[PDB]
Amino acid sequence: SHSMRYFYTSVSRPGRGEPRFISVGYVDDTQFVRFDSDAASPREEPRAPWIEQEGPEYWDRNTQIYKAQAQTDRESLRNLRGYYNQSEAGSHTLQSMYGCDVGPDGRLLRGHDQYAYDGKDYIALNEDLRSWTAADTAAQITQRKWEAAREAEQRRAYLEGECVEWLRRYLENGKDKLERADPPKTHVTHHPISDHEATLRCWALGFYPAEITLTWQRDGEDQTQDTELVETRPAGDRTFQKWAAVVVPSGEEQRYTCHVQHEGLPKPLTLRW
Amino acid sequence: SPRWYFYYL
């Protein structure tokens, strides 16, 4: 199963120019393109090895789509400021995320088209792709307008066909890097916190995609509410990391195992100290 | 590739 997603961010900065617009595009957890209106010569640019091959028409067409989009977001931002009765002096943020999730057959499982204003839900296209969820009374203004113009029907074309077709192209380009999971390497560390307790930390490193489960067990049952987890974090070279830690009685470290669940594993690893 | 599709909120 796979997905392609575009993420758009416009940020107003009154008195210091026109809004900044940045976009990034992802296939699953791999970023492959960017656009930043504040660059020297703003244009779409490659960010993964397998997209570089694309010709100048690719880059030109997309670059023109982003510049056009950015200009409409300047008007949307002014509209939004008005709906919420806000001042002209404040910086505000409009974010947008859209794209397609496909299953094993390669056809659409789920379409996405959603928006936030100042970091909170504004409006989202529902999974039937025929109706919207407005977040508050301001957003119902947009909803009424978009219902009247038949926005959802118009959006379905890209989300069902074109989105899906590009995703397939890109899976072809990327091959292993995109289609074969890179399993978690691992380690277990141990650190006494006193003469009667220690920390055991389970480490999961250089993995891809980001989805993973790390679980501490004692004698078999999970150690649910006494585990510290850190957010999954990017390694900096397209892989991910996580750790989970539990504090245990000294001399009992033998009772504890760390179960690691990731798509790149033939079977759930079981680690010990 | 991004969509060729334009709107106002």
């Epitope: 023109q64 789509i65 056009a68 200009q71 409409t72 300047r74 008007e75 118009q154 074309a157 066909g161 074109e162 | 060729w4 599709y5 334009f6 709107y7 106002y8």
Partner: T-cell receptor, first 101, second 115 residues
Amino acid sequence: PQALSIQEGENATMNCSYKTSINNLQWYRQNSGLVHLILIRSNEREKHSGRLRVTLDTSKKSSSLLITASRAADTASYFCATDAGPEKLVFGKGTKLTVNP
Amino acid sequence: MNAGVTQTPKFRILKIGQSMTLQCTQDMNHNYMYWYRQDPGMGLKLIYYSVGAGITDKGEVPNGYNVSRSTTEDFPLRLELAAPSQTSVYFCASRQLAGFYEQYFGPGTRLTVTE
């Protein structure tokens, strides 16, 4: 210059072509200020509204417009426009249609 | 009274070397405006366009002309030094948005340049 003469009541078909890859094609009419008639998107093969039916074939880079049961006020020149980037249209050569009584 | 694009003047004669301003106004609150010229029996050619107040850019045949867009409602076209090649019908148009939107046209200004 392309020209087409018919009798009121008959159907009229007109064609246009274009040169680049596109996202949409719009037919317009002009007689007497252009007025738009119908828009078709590059994912669509046929669309209709009232007496008009438009078709599009992106392999051939061509579109046809069919007016069912032509009337005197259909007499006009008919043109196509296609996108040239998100913000601009490029317009082609018309077809002059004359609907005779 | 309807919404639409209006233009003045309807008709103009200019001597070679004279200058002129064609006015275009619309009341549909459209951000995107366009100027075209059309020789009789021929197609439209884009001169300049504007995506919003304070923004203009060149079309296919910009030479000989300039525009400005200080408000949303108006898009004036300036003819700087008339030459015989500028005899034509000049059409202003507007639309609501980029992408899948049709344009609305003004009635046209018919210009004859004469020695």
